[PDB]
Ligand binder design. Structure first.
Ligand SMILES: [Mg+2]
Ligand SMILES: [Mg+2]
Ligand SMILES: [Mg+2]
Ligand SMILES: [Mg+2]
Ligand SMILES: [Mg+2]
Ligand SMILES: [Mg+2]
Ligand SMILES: [Mg+2]
Ligand SMILES: [Mg+2]
Ligand SMILES: [Mg+2]
Ligand SMILES: [Mg+2]
Ligand SMILES: [Mg+2]
Ligand SMILES: [Mg+2]
Ligand SMILES: [Mg+2]
Ligand SMILES: [Mg+2]
Ligand SMILES: [Mg+2]
Ligand SMILES: [Mg+2]
Ligand SMILES: [Mg+2]
Ligand SMILES: [Mg+2]
Ligand SMILES: [Mg+2]
Ligand SMILES: [Mg+2]
Ligand SMILES: [Mg+2]
Ligand SMILES: [Mg+2]
Ligand SMILES: [Mg+2]
Ligand SMILES: [Mg+2]
Ligand SMILES: [Mg+2]
Ligand SMILES: [Mg+2]
Ligand SMILES: [Mg+2]
Ligand SMILES: [Mg+2]
Ligand SMILES: [Mg+2]
Ligand SMILES: [Mg+2]
Ligand SMILES: [Mg+2]
Ligand SMILES: [Mg+2]
Ligand SMILES: [Mg+2]
Ligand SMILES: [Mg+2]
Ligand SMILES: [Mg+2]
Ligand SMILES: [Mg+2]
Ligand SMILES: [Mg+2]
Ligand SMILES: [Mg+2]
Ligand SMILES: [Mg+2]
Ligand SMILES: [Mg+2]
Ligand SMILES: [Mg+2]
Ligand SMILES: [Mg+2]
Ligand SMILES: [Mg+2]
Ligand SMILES: [Mg+2]
Ligand SMILES: [Mg+2]
Ligand SMILES: [Mg+2]
Ligand SMILES: [Mg+2]
Ligand SMILES: [Mg+2]
Ligand SMILES: [Mg+2]
Ligand SMILES: [Mg+2]
Ligand SMILES: [Mg+2]
Ligand SMILES: [Mg+2]
Ligand SMILES: [Mg+2]
Ligand SMILES: [Mg+2]
Ligand SMILES: [Mg+2]
Ligand SMILES: [Mg+2]
Ligand SMILES: [Mg+2]
Ligand SMILES: [Mg+2]
Ligand SMILES: [Mg+2]
Ligand SMILES: [Mg+2]
Ligand SMILES: [Mg+2]
Ligand SMILES: [Mg+2]
Ligand SMILES: [Mg+2]
Ligand SMILES: [Mg+2]
Ligand SMILES: [Mg+2]
Lengths: 77, 45, 175, 111, 59, 141
RNA sequence: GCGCUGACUGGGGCCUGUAGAGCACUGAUAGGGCUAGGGGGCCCACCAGCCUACCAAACCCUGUCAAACUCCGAAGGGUCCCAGGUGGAGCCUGGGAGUGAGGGCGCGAGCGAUAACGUCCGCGUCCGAGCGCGGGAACAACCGAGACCGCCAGCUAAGGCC
RNA sequence: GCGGUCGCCUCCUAAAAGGUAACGGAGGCGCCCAAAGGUCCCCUCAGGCGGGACGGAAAUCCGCCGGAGAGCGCAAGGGUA
RNA sequence: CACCUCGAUGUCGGCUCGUCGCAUCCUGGGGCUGAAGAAGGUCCCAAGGGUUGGGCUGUUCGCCCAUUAAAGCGGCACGCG
RNA sequence: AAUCCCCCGUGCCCAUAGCGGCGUGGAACCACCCGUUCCCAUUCCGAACACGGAAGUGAAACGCGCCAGCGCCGAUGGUACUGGGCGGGCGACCGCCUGGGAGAGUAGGUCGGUGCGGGGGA
């Protein structure tokens, strides 16, 4: 017999809205494990590091080098 | 050790968690009741 | 001493077809130039056997010129180990790095009967001007006894130029 | 030694500010002088400036400071500006910086 | 100008999205010619099926 | 018998034999070499059957370089087969060898002497080979 | 009931860590040099102590390997926008089901022995339900091709033309 | 049948969205902390080298170099000065 | 492995009756021999025919007795209820 | 006002701005610096943090330059791989078409650029 045999549930992680999608206040934007997308303008980040639109708007991505990747919501939806 | 916090009178309040023998003491800390507002809140039972 | 081959020009004409044609694709470049060239394969082999990035190939090619090219890469395709592309580096006078072969001249030179010859490098990398190009390098070193290791400045250093360093290294020793 | 306590604590106190997204009232105190800008980030642009240098004053820098404080309100409040966030940068909020701050009232408020 | 696409080989046994393509060019049966505008979208589908189809440019 | 000391995981997946490639391939250490014509898992007990064929031909003389190494664990099910329960039981190790790679590669021996050794050495191998010499094409580096 | 929103396609953004490759990390690892530790062979037994044709840290040259390594990283794939796309398309509400034993083949993996008409997933296809037609001697699933009926008419596909 | 297994977390398998199987490869959980919690204010590692009584491979001290390989209560991953 | 057969494809061994294969036990023909002769060894050709009787065990097989030119090995639903 | 140059802030690009070596700056800015009464301070130490200063020095720090030993960036050609279409091999696997096309490596490149506001020069 085998002492192996487990695995855990898929956590269905990753990005839930991409650039230039129209979001709404509260929409969550990224589901993620560490801080690998840091919150930008109008983007909150919850205790599971999870990012959500603060305002209705549209989503843009920004790659700031050693500063990291950033998700902003650009208002006036 | 499951934990249950009384306060003074009217006895409704809220409950808690203590997994330790510290504090072994009367275990009392400040909190908000549903009727009056923010009283002493000791621990019973 | 002097290696001439050939060259030609190309723009379109898939290298698959050329290669199928007996002609070895390649490129021609230096600081001032980049150009697509091809050569005959059989022609190139006979020269490159000899030349081999140690020596200057003067190309030629139509609109006939003569370009002082060093060959700086050969890509062989691994399956058949036959070269599938060459790129020729054209000289003009600025100090430039390259590989100069070594000649070990002498007897065992110390601890004879018997030592260990033990050549570490068959070549060396040296910053050298196009004008004076040292086609080989004399290594005598009468000893070379047990426990001695030749580094860099213990080498001839032909009147042309200096090294590509680092001066601390090993070339031959006897253990 | 990479990236000193100075430049950490500096970032640490700055980054928090730049989050709330107000106008930033930045404060540079030197050994002689004390200067203050009011900056709009995302336009990357200074709006209203004040200093002991440009107002050519001296005499006891904590008192000088409060003066470049009242000086900044004045100039700034004039453009519509109210509600900023007080930088304080590497400095403990104390002394000369506390004073430019606590003289930066009557406009540019909440500190 | 425009395009003459004519179905020369059955889609039977080719992926569903290629089958979807011939629908977008409204080719329902073998040998059926269709003459439709040459534009980037009409071109994509015509290329996607290029192995089942025969094309010529036409006014 | 070659075999890694201190492995990180015993038992790794089989994976494919595709794509003759990836280094080795140019004869860096010696005067002559054995190059792989076809892909194979080549077994530690195969490599040492090649090594010894050659040292025997040099009468303990010469220099021999190897240059493939058996780091891939080979499992087997005991006899007693039945599919399941687990995976089980590493036998040997193999090195994966795709075409154009140089294994072995002798030096410090007369040409016809080494060429006879490499030919012997080759018969101990499951795939086809090619003997090679060394080249301008094997560059400098 | 809605009614242009559909599959597929064009352009544009964003997302990703595989094929390939790489060795910067985690490990593995060939040859050499230089070197702690050491087997030691031993010079003493006080610190001493010279040599390594054995181990072997680090370090440097050369040379590789990896599902649970990655300094890199394609093609593709996903999603939103704008356009084409009128289709036995799409969306919403409801009525009726049946199905929840699948199989072969291609491709990508695992298990297996780089066995099985083997087993287990993925993406595709066909048989299933097209054991109706043509090709493959014969032959569910390979090639050709989607059979409404009729004709002692024509052109072709695959495969063929003694 | 016997043996193993049965819920939860981490990684790989998994084919660069998601999801994805096998009696495929490996590991972990059934707790814990009144501070290991909130906030404000400071501070920045491991490691290497040189120095320094008892101090030894590493107790504490000083110098320099060290961008994160340390730490984050516990498995792994992601994250993080 | 689980593909036809569980609304039945009777299962070992023996006996009877064979037929086929040849990777040949014998007989026939060969090469090499570390083949003097005789007698062997090994390998090649060859399937026409032959290929014993007993003790023990349900045995196949094996061991043994006595012989022999030899006491062949396989297949045919481990051939044949 | 503008253009320029120098300094001080403060952003942006996020190493082509970095390490190292050399050189250079004190009028002004900035630093170190002078003190520790006072505010306020260091699990001890005004080291730091803080205040009051202004004699000195640009030694340290910083700013500006120069050098390619390192670091970092890096083509073009060519391959690998591959979306779609086809072949081949008992197989492991290979090849052709059409479109896309790395990684390493070679040539090279770089000792930053730039915005807003100050102070000073012209
Ligand atoms: Mg999982
Ligand atoms: Mg078909
Ligand atoms: Mg699709
Ligand atoms: Mg190879
Ligand atoms: Mg062979
Ligand atoms: Mg429409
Ligand atoms: Mg659509
Ligand atoms: Mg599209
Ligand atoms: Mg790979
Ligand atoms: Mg490595
Ligand atoms: Mg990988
Ligand atoms: Mg790159
Ligand atoms: Mg897209
Ligand atoms: Mg539309
Ligand atoms: Mg339908
Ligand atoms: Mg319904
Ligand atoms: Mg089922
Ligand atoms: Mg199916
Ligand atoms: Mg299935
Ligand atoms: Mg195929
Ligand atoms: Mg099957
Ligand atoms: Mg199969
Ligand atoms: Mg299927
Ligand atoms: Mg059925
Ligand atoms: Mg059929
Ligand atoms: Mg169908
Ligand atoms: Mg039938
Ligand atoms: Mg037929
Ligand atoms: Mg029909
Ligand atoms: Mg035909
Ligand atoms: Mg049981
Ligand atoms: Mg996935
Ligand atoms: Mg996928
Ligand atoms: Mg467990
Ligand atoms: Mg330390
Ligand atoms: Mg020390
Ligand atoms: Mg860590
Ligand atoms: Mg069955
Ligand atoms: Mg089955
Ligand atoms: Mg039955
Ligand atoms: Mg029946
Ligand atoms: Mg019956
Ligand atoms: Mg015979
Ligand atoms: Mg005879
Ligand atoms: Mg005889
Ligand atoms: Mg005979
Ligand atoms: Mg016979
Ligand atoms: Mg009897
Ligand atoms: Mg009996
Ligand atoms: Mg028996
Ligand atoms: Mg008998
Ligand atoms: Mg018989
Ligand atoms: Mg049987
Ligand atoms: Mg029977
Ligand atoms: Mg009977
Ligand atoms: Mg001065
Ligand atoms: Mg002066
Ligand atoms: Mg005092
Ligand atoms: Mg203190
Ligand atoms: Mg200085
Ligand atoms: Mg590059
Ligand atoms: Mg390219
Ligand atoms: Mg392709
Ligand atoms: Mg490149
Ligand atoms: Mg600037």
């Amino acid at each position: 017999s085998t002492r192996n045999g487990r695995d855990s549930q898929a956590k269905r992680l990753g990005v839930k809205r991409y650039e230039g999608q129209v979001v709404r206040a509260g929409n969550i934007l990224v589901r993620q494990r560490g801080t690998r997308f840091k919150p930008g303008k109008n983007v909150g980040m919850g205790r599971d590091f999870t990012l959500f639109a603060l305002v209705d708007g549209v989503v843009e991505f920004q790659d700031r080098g050693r500063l990291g990747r950033y998700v902003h919501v650009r208002p006036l939806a | 050790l499951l934990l249950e916090c009384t306060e003074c009178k009217r006895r409704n309040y809220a409950t808690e968690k203590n997994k330790r023998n510290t504090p072994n003491k009367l275990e009392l800390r400040k909190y908000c009741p549903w009727c009056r507002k923010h009283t002493v809140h000791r621990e019973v039972k | 001493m002097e290696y001439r081959l050939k060259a030609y020009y190309r723009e379109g004409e898939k290298p698959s077809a050329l290669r199928r044609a007996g002609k070895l694709p390649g490129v021609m470049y230096n600081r001032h130039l980049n150009r697509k060239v091809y050569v005959d394969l059989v022609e190139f082999d006979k020269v490159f056997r000899q030349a081999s990035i140690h020596h200057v190939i003067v190309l030629e090619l139509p609109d006939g010129q003569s370009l002082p090219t060093l060959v700086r890469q050969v890509n062989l395709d691994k399956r058949r180990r036959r070269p599938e592309h060459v790129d020729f580096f054209v000289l003009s006078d600025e100090p430039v790095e390259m590989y100069v072969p070594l000649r070990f001249v002498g007897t065992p030179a110390g601890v004879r009967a018997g030592g260990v010859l033990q050549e570490i490098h068959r070549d060396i990398l040296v910053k050298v001007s196009p004008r004076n190009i040292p086609e080989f390098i004399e290594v005598d070193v009468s000893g070379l006894e047990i426990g001695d290791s030749l580094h860099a400045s213990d080498l001839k250093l032909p009147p042309g130029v200096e090294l590509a360093v680092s001066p601390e290294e090993t070339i031959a020793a006897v253990v | 030694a990479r990236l000193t306590a100075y430049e950490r604590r500096k970032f640490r106190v700055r980054n928090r500010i730049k989050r709330t997204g107000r106008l930033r009232l930045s404060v540079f105190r030197s050994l002689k002088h004390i200067y203050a800008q009011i900056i709009d980030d995302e336009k990357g642009v200074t709006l209203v400036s004040a200093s002991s240098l440009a107002l050519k004053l001296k005499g006891n820098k904590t008192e000088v400071a409060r003066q470049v404080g009242r000086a900044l309100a004045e100039k700034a409040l004039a453009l519509g500006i109210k509600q900023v966030a007080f930088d304080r940068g590497p400095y403990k909020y104390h002394g000369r910086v506390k004073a430019l701050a606590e003289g930066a009232r009557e406009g540019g408020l909440e500190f | 100008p425009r395009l003459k696409v004519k179905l020369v080989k059955s889609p039977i046994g080719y992926p569903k999205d290629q089958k979807a393509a011939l629908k977008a060019l409204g080719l329902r049966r073998l040998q059926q010619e269709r003459v439709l505008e040459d534009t980037p979208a009409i071109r994509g589908n015509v290329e996607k099926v290029a192995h089942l189809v025969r094309v010529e440019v036409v006014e | 018998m070659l075999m890694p000391r201190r492995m990180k995981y015993r038992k790794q997946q089989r994976g494919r034999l595709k794509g003759a490639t990836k280094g080795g391939d140019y004869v860096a250490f010696g005067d002559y070499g054995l190059v792989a014509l076809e892909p194979a898992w080549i077994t530690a007990q195969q490599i040492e059957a090649a090594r010894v064929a050659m040292v025997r031909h040099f009468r303990r003389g010469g220099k021999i370089f190897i240059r493939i190494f058996p780091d891939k664990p080979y499992t087997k099910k005991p006899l007693e087969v039945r599919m399941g329960k687990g995976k089980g039981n590493v036998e040997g190790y193999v090195a994966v060898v795709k075409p154009g790679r140089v294994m072995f590669e002798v030096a410090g021996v007369t040409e016809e002497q080494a060429m006879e050794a490499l030919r012997i050495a080759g018969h101990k191998l499951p795939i086809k080979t090619k003997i090679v010499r060394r080249d301008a094409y094997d560059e400098a580096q």
